[PDB]
Structures are given as structure tokens and as C-alpha cells.
Amino acid sequence: TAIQLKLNPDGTMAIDEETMVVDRHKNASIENEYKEKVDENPFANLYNYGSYGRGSYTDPWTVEEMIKFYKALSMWGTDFNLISQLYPYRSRKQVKAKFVNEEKKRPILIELALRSKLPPNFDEYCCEIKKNIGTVADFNEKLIELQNEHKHHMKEIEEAKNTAKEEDQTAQRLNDAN
């Protein structure tokens, strides 16, 4: 949506007065034409106390998930930060409540986990590295090296800052002389 010109035989190298301005609605109206049309039934909009309040329906847990839940709770004490991404589209809040409701549901199966203070049955070696094979890079030094690049760009724009400043005072000092 840049400005457009044309080449007349009468006046060559003339620029279009209508392309100088933009309408800001023709682009919006294209997609609004290509939206689905439905006829509102005033019964459909019904609302109750369960409206406009955050919280949703949790997808109930399966036993295939529990072996990735018990063992992630067997390795660490109780660490909700890194186990969240293990269940990729589950969030930090409802998985904390999954720790809470199991206290009343299975109080004794949890009580075996904190007694276990040792490396467990050695089958987590795959799940040790299945977590690691996502974006394989030395993260203990990957964050260091590009952070040093960032302050290098900030130092160069700081060099560009003062070198712009010194020539500016130099130029208008000459205007003060004249």
C-alpha cells in the first residue's frame, strides 16, 4: 500500500492524488464479506451465573498420564514449573489442583513417593532425554553467548548516540559564530 504514480503524455512523472490517501476500510470489508452469516434467535443468548468468568473444563486424566505423573513426582519433591510443559497444553493452575485432589483420593499411593529418596527404577533414562531432545543446545551457555551479543548492539548504538551528539554541538557552534 505504498504511493503510486503514472506517466502521462501531458504531464509526465505525475503522482496520483487518490493514492496519496488511504481508505482504511476496503481492506477490512473484504474479510467481513467473507464471514459466515447467521440469524440471531433471542433465545440463544441466554446467560447465567456461569458467564464471563475465567475457568474452563479440565480434560480428565488418564492412566497413561499417571506413569508420567508419578515418576515426575518421584524424581523431584513437588516442582510444578517443569512438569507443566511435560503436559504440553495443560496449564500451571489445574495441575496444582491435581496434586491437591489426589490427597483425598489416593493418600497412600502418594505417601510412597516421598519415602523414595534414591534414583528410582531405572526406566526414566528415556524420559530424562526425551525432555532433553527438544531443541538440543547447551542451555547453560547458550543464554550467555547471545546476551553478550545484545549488550554489544547496545554499546554500538551508544557509540552511535554520542557520535551523533558531538557532531551536533560542533555544527551549531559554527552557526553561533556566524
Binding site: 500500500t1 505504498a2 504511493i3 503510486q4 504514480l5 506517466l7 509526465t12 512523472m13 503522482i15 488511504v22 548516540k161 551523533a164 551528539k165 551536533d168 551549531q172 557552534r173 553561533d176
Partner: protein, 246 residues
């Protein structure tokens, strides 16, 4: 196609940014094609938003700008980069926020929401200007505050230069360099302005169009004797006032 556009911008960046180019030398410089397809790649180069169209008065003029600022403005959207062109067109004296609204027709909310993001992109700062105080003035980081200093403590400069003449304009300029005075730039015009305030106070006198002699306020400093004149002012109804005739 592309290679013809790669040749022309290397010619635009060939010269130093001044000496603003035009067509009458461009067809002398790049005239291997006719004007019908030369314009079509320049309008395509306008579609690649590198070339801009600057104005010397009453006639058609061109100006190429560097690729470094072209990439960072391509990150913005249509309206985001559009308002960024107005501030960089101003450049040296800033631009007033209400006048920016006048040149867009975008109303007060959509312009302020745009530049709120733009300061976080570190392309625009806000300065305080004095020829119209308390107005919003925006510039780049290129720092042109062309608009001595307005706030006080001129008297610290002023009270010392009386002492140099008390014992008895070019003779001042060597004296003001020393004595660790908190100054950054002086000029012979400033000392001429700094001296005539004392002329209005009759602290010293102007003779022979540049010389200065003291009006002997030193004996008044230490009927025309307003010091040591303390009044009674209490329990005396018979006093004289300068007001209370109106």
C-alpha cells in the same frame, strides 16, 4: 528485473546524503532503458519502499535513504510506520502532538496507542522545549535541542564579574575561563548581555561604547541612603505611606 534495481540504489547510496538527486541527472546516469520502463522499476522500488520523494520548491525531486532504517520500519504496520515518517521529517525542531493528529485525521486514542509502543522500540524520545512550554515535543535519538540556561544561578556568574571591575569586554573573557566556573560554552555576545543587567541596576556604567566604570555602589554596599533606615512602624499612627492615595 531485480538487478536493474540493485544498480540504481547503489548509485543512490554512492554520494553523500546531501546533494539531493533528481531525474535530469538520473537519465544521464541510468538511461540504458527508456523512461517507460525506468519508472516502472522505480515505482516497484517505491513498492519496495526504499526510495522516498523529497521536495525542493515548485518542482519534482527524489532522495534515496539507507537500507538500515528501511528494515526496522518494515517491522511496523501501515499506521505504525506512517506516523513514524512525520517525526523523522521534522527531525531538528521536533513536532507537536496535536499537529500530528491534524496531519493524519487519526483521532486522539489511536495516535497515542501507536507511539506508546514506539517509545519501547527506542526510536523516539520526548524533550522539554521552552519557546512554547508544556507541549509534547518528539524527536529521534539524534539529539537536536537547538531550542544562558533558562533556570536561575546566573547570579553566580554575575556577582563575580562585578568584583573584577570593582578594583578596576575582551578583558573579561580570559578571566571567566579559570576559577572552575560551571560553564560549558561562553561567547563575547553573552558577556555583553551579562553586563547590561548591572547597567540597569546602576552597579556600573557604560562609557565609550565598550568600556565600563563603577558607579561606586561599593560605599552603598559596605537623600539616596536607603540602608540603615529602619522604621518605627509600631505604636505610631503618624507615618507616611506611598500607597493609600489610590
Amino acid at each position: 528485473l531485480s538487478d536493474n534495481a540493485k544498480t540504481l540504489h547503489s548509485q543512490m547510496m554512492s554520494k553523500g546524503i546531501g546533494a539531493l538527486f533528481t531525474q535530469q541527472e538520473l537519465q544521464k546516469q541510468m538511461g540504458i532503458g527508456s523512461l517507460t520502463d525506468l519508472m516502472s522499476i522505480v515505482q516497484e522500488l517505491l513498492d519496495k519502499n526504499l526510495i522516498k520523494l523529497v521536495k525542493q520548491n515548485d518542482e519534482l525531486k527524489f532522495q534515496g535513504v539507507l537500507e538500515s532504517e528501511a528494515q526496522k520500519k518494515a517491522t511496523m504496520s501501515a499506521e505504525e510506520a506512517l506516523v513514524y515518517s512525520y517525526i523523522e521529517a521534522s527531525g531538528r525542531e521536533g513536532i507537536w502532538s496535536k499537529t500530528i493528529k491534524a496531519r493524519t485525521n487519526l483521532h486522539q486514542h489511536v495516535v497515542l496507542k501507536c507511539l506508546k509502543s514506539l517509545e519501547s522500540q527506542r526510536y523516539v524520545k520526548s524533550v522539554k522545549s521552552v519557546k512554547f512550554p508544556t507541549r509534547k515535543i518528539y524527536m529521534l535519538y539524534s539529539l537536536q535541542p537547538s531550542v544562558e540556561l533558562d533556570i536561575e544561578f546566573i547570579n553566580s556568574l554575575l556577582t563575580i564579574v562585578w568584583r573584577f571591575i570593582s578594583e578596576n569586554t575582551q578583558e573579561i573573557l580570559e578571566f571567566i575561563t579559570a576559577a572552575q566556573v560551571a560553564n560549558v560554552e561562553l561567547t563575547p555576545s553573552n558577556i555583553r548581555s551579562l553586563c547590561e543587567v548591572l547597567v540597569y541596576d546602576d552597579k556600573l556604567e557604560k562609557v565609550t561604547h565598550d568600556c565600563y566604570r563603577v558607579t561606586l555602589e561599593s560605599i552603598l554596599q559596605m537623600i539616596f541612603n536607603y540602608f540603615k533606615m529602619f522604621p518605627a512602624s509600631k505604636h505610631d499612627k503618624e507615618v507616611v505611606y506611598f500607597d493609600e492615595w489610590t
